[PDB]
Design an enzyme around this catalytic site. Structure first.
Site, mmCIF file in Angstrom:
data_model
loop_
_atom_site.group_PDB
_atom_site.id
_atom_site.type_symbol
_atom_site.label_atom_id
_atom_site.label_comp_id
_atom_site.label_asym_id
_atom_site.label_seq_id
_atom_site.Cartn_x
_atom_site.Cartn_y
_atom_site.Cartn_z
ATOM 1 N N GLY C 44 5.088 -20.143 -11.381
ATOM 2 C CA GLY C 44 6.442 -20.176 -10.942
ATOM 3 C C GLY C 44 7.304 -20.852 -11.939
ATOM 4 O O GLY C 44 8.502 -20.920 -11.497
ATOM 5 N N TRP C 46 8.138 -20.124 -14.871
ATOM 6 C CA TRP C 46 9.203 -18.922 -15.199
ATOM 7 C C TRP C 46 10.444 -18.704 -14.304
ATOM 8 O O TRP C 46 11.596 -18.452 -14.667
ATOM 9 C CB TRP C 46 8.849 -17.759 -15.785
ATOM 10 N N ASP C 64 3.619 -11.213 -9.949
ATOM 11 C CA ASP C 64 2.243 -11.758 -10.551
ATOM 12 C C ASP C 64 1.341 -11.697 -9.489
ATOM 13 O O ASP C 64 1.333 -11.547 -8.386
ATOM 14 C CB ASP C 64 2.276 -13.180 -11.086
ATOM 15 N N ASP C 80 0.145 -6.704 -8.850
ATOM 16 C CA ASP C 80 -0.070 -6.562 -10.306
ATOM 17 C C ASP C 80 1.355 -6.180 -10.777
ATOM 18 O O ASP C 80 2.342 -5.760 -10.182
ATOM 19 C CB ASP C 80 -0.998 -5.239 -10.469
ATOM 20 N N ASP C 105 4.892 -13.311 -19.113
ATOM 21 C CA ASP C 105 4.067 -14.469 -19.667
ATOM 22 C C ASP C 105 2.200 -14.214 -19.373
ATOM 23 O O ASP C 105 1.681 -15.029 -18.735
ATOM 24 C CB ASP C 105 4.392 -15.661 -18.767
ATOM 25 N N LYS C 145 5.618 -13.189 -24.267
ATOM 26 C CA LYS C 145 4.646 -13.967 -24.916
ATOM 27 C C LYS C 145 3.388 -13.141 -25.516
ATOM 28 O O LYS C 145 3.047 -12.052 -24.678
ATOM 29 C CB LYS C 145 4.130 -14.932 -24.135
#
Lengths: 341, 174, 166, 209
Positions: C44, C46, C64, C80, C105, C145
């Site tokens: 959490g 982000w 997530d 997902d 991320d 990322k």
RNA sequence: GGGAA
RNA sequence: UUGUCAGGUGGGGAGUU
């Protein structure tokens, strides 16, 4: 009995019996029989059910922005920058802000500490609007606590005039003085004296009078649910007598010869007919020189002229009554009287 | 309510002076409204003439508050015990320093203003001088005694200390 | 380290939150992010930065597989990142608005070949980049990322054709 | 000696005093403002020179390091009060003393050095000063009127209530205080109706900006 | 040691 | 405006313990 079964029985009784509905309401809401009967007598069966249902819903948080310190737009921008969702409280009040979500504490914000906004019920804002204090005028407040009404009156007066606020309880008076100091009210004088003696023992001749007389808490059931079962007939009679005495003292203290006009605004936190209408009728009979005037509020139920065997004067309709099921705000009654001589 | 005698006036008129300096003149006299100082219990109260005139009616023991307090009269005869005068002190402030968003919270809790947390300066601030703390929104925050000066503050270590907290706006509800 | 300590002191859940806020400071995508979609938002960090940086009332959605603690004015979707059902939920909340900025991320676990972990992250970036172009508005931003590898140059090439600036 | 005689050459005397003040000793700087402020009992014009030269003397570089104080606020209130008689008496530029002539020129010059002061103003005191500046702008040529309004136009302060209801107008008062109002809501409305047509558009450009 | 960021 | 009465305040002043 099951709560769902009790609710279904109450709904069936409302659709169609009175004793069963009252018992179901008492079992579900936990209200006293006397209070439930009085509410059922005051409002319609559908209206009483709606009022009882709305009594459990928590009222929205309302904050009054201090026009003496910051503007409403700036306060809204600061609240938005703080991650707090706030919207204007209708169109009647241009400063009232209702907060839906707030990531940070409302009362611990830098603006709240600075006195930009003060947390107060939207109903309390209505009594200030009804009073309509003028600059350079002498305004006497019968009940200073908690100071929200006094701060609003001073802001309306733009720190002009003299606001003499009286509080019966020393503990509440200290908090009211602290709130006034935080709000930056410069011409406010706080006293701790009886309202009845205030007209004759302390000072009289106030240009405007604001009497937020204590009430049984019928409209503040959500705030204090203890009053639902702590309400008694003797207590209600004592409160009515105290309210009548306070109204008489306020009328006596009000100067009819004041250039700004001898306007006295009486406010009650309960929607009880005997607390609002009977007190107004008693005050009118005791003081013929005081005549009911329009409160000027765009919202609020008109005062009842005939309730069961009790009949009120035609001018009693000018009183403004708000209900949680009607105006979505805490129950309150506002009456405005003007002195002629 | 009790009128202030000469010794306590001179005892507190310097105490204003480290913060507002000679700016007290607009306070003690104002022809529009003869709004002079008044003293109830040990709390010095800054009120209007009409405030006293109404306050004359109310009992000294009964009347707990009147106008704005400038601080209690302690045994050593000093004030700042209340910040209720922050609006007046900020307006007539000789010296004001701005504290960034990092520095507003430790001040609002009463911790002294860190060097890294200093935003802006009056550029000519002596040691041990009564100064007034402001935020980015030009809002008064409290009273602070600064033992640092712009001359050496311009090149200082962040974690160093500049202005000591005396009172803050948080105390209003803290 | 130091960044972990400030995360505990400030309340930020992880150092990756400090990574996101620095990106916002240096690029200003989150400030103008009316609609933000957070792929692999757990735990959490982000999501918290996106909520704080974005103006309140924005369309904040963090999806997530791992559970995410609730955040005000944010939709925490524990599914997902690119599932057909979550894509339906993202478009269900998107409505007339369209995705403006997306944060990613994706972090595969360690304990295998570096090349495996590097390609596992890169493919998950590309396969998450798939949902972006599906949901993104013209001129949108995608902050993801990536693990540097030999396929990193190829991934940049795909970024260059599918976005104006890298 | 010229100042003592109080002749018509006070203009050149203050000109020289302002120009050569930085050459004199520090102790004399503190006593220099006493002679300027002792002439308060063309009287408005002379008081303009005293306050302007007092500003110039205080404008000397490094006065922060040499904390001579001297509380030039007495000159500030003199300028604050002197604008009304300047608006009362007439002024003509004709066609073809601090540093120049044409009295309106110093006023903006004192205002611009006042603005040039590092953070000394825009602390809710400039707005109170600017309100009477607009009041005094009821007459005088539009180019002068546009100039003073242009000073607040280019002002770094973001206050916008100067030309409308404003905070308490303390420091000699004699004006609408409106204490504790804070409303983003007068003079331009009447300024639109004025002899020169271009004042109307000047008022329009102010409210639009 | 080289190449690329 | 000017006078009268009643009330409040009153270690401000005067007087009792």
């Amino acid at each position: 009995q099951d709560l769902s079964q009790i609710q279904l029985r109450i709904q069936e009784i409302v659709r169609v019996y009175v004793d069963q509905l009252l018992n179901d309401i008492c079992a579900y809401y936990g209200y006293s029989r006397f209070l439930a009967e009085k509410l059922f007598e005051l409002f319609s069966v559908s209206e009483a059910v709606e009022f009882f249902e709305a009594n459990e819903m928590p009222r929205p948080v309302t904050i009054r922005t201090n026009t003496l310190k910051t503007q409403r737009r700036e306060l809204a921008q600061a609240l938005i920058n703080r991650g707090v969702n706030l919207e204007p409280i209708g169109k009647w009040s241009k400063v009232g802000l209702q907060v839906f979500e707030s990531q940070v504490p409302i009362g611990a914000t830098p603006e709240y500490l600075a006195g930009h906004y003060i947390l107060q019920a939207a109903s309390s804002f209505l009594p200030v609007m009804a009073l309509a204090p003028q600059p350079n005028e002498r305004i006497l407040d019968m009940s200073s606590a908690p100071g929200g009404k006094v701060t609003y009156v001073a802001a309306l007066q733009k720190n002009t005039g003299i606001i003499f606020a009286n509080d019966s309880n020393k503990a509440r008076t200290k908090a009211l003085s602290a709130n006034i100091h935080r709000l930056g009210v410069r011409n406010a004088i706080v006293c701790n004296y009886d309202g009845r003696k205030f007209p004759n023992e302390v000072i009289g001749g106030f240009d405007r009078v604001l009497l937020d007389a204590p009430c049984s808490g019928t409209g503040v059931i959500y705030k204090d649910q203890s009053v639902k079962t702590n309400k008694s007939e003797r207590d209600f009679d004592t409160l009515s007598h105290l309210q009548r005495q306070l109204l008489l003292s306020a009328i006596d203290s009000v100067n009819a010869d004041s250039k700004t006009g001898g306007f006295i605004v009486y406010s009650t936190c309960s929607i009880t007919v005997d607390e609002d209408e009977a007190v107004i009728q008693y005050a009118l009979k005791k003081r013929p020189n005081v005549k009911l005037v329009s409160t000027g509020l765009e919202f609020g139920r008109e005062g009842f002229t005939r309730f069961r065997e009790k009949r009120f004067h035609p001018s009693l309709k000018l009183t403004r009554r708000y209900y949680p099921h009607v105006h979505n705000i805490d129950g309150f009654f506002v009456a405005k009287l003007k002195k002629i001589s | 309510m009790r009128p202030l005698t000469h010794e306590e006036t001179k005892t507190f008129f310097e105490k204003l002076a480290q913060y507002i300096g000679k700016n007290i003149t607009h306070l003690i006299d104002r022809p529009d409204d003869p709004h002079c100082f008044r003293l109830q219990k040990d709390r010095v109260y800054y009120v209007s003439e009409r405030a006293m005139k109404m306050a004359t009616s109310v009992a000294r023991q009964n009347l707990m508050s009147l106008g704005i307090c400038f601080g209690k009269f302690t045994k050593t005869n000093k004030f700042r015990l209340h910040i209720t005068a922050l609006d007046y002190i900020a307006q007539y402030a000789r010296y004001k320093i701005w504290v960034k968003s990092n520095g507003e919270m430790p001040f609002l809790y009463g911790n002294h203003v860190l060097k890294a947390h200093v935003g802006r300066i009056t550029d000519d601030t002596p040691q041990h001088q009564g100064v007034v703390i402001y935020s980015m929104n030009d809002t008064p925050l409290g009273f602070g005694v600064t033992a640092r000066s712009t001359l050496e503050l311009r090149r200082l270590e962040p974690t160093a200390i500049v202005a000591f907290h005396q009172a803050d706006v948080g105390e209003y509800l803290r | 380290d130091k960044w972990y300590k400030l995360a505990k002191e400030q309340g930020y859940r992880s150092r990756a939150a400090f990574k996101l806020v620095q990106l916002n400071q240096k690029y200003s995508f989150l400030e103008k992010a009316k609609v933000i979609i957070d792929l692999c938002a757990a735990p959490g960090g982000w999501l918290q930065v996106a909520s704080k940086t974005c103006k309140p009332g924005s369309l904040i959605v963090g999806v997530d597989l791992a559970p995410i603690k609730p955040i005000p004015n944010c939709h925490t979707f524990v599914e997902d990142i690119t599932s057909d059902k979550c894509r339906s939920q993202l478009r269900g909340y998107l409505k007339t608005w369209k995705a403006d900025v997306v944060l990613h991320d994706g972090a595969p676990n360690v304990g295998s070949a570096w090349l495996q972990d590097a390609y596992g992250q890169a493919q998950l970036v590309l396969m998450s980049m798939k949902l972006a172009c599906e949901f993104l508005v013209a001129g949108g931003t995608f902050v993801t990322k990536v693990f540097r590898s030999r396929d990193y140059n190829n991934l940049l090439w795909v970024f260059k054709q599918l976005f104006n600036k890298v | 000696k010229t100042l003592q005689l109080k002749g018509k050459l006070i203009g050149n005397a203050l000109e020289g005093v302002a120009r050569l003040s930085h050459l004199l000793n520090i102790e004399f700087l503190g006593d220099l403002l006493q002679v300027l402020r002792e002439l308060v009992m063309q009287a408005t014009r002379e008081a303009l020179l005293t306050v302007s030269t007092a500003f110039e003397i205080a404008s000397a570089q490094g006065v922060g390091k040499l904390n001579l104080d001297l509380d030039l606020g007495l000159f500030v209130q003199r300028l604050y009060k002197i604008i009304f008689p300047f608006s009362l008496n007439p002024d003509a530029d004709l066609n073809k003393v601090v540093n120049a002539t044409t009295e309106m020129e110093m006023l903006l010059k004192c205002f611009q050095v006042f603005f040039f002061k590092s953070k000394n103003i825009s602390s809710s005191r400039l707005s109170s000063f600017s309100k009477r500046l607009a009041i005094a702008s009821m007459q005088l040529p539009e180019h002068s009127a546009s100039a003073d309004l242009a000073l607040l136009k280019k002002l770094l302060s973001r206050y916008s209530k100067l030309s409308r209801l404003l905070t308490s107008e303390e420091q000699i008062g004699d004006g609408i205080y409106n204490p504790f109002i804070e409303d983003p809501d007068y003079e331009p409305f009447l300024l639109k109706n004025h002899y020169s047509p271009a004042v109307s558009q000047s008022a329009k450009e102010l409210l639009k900006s």
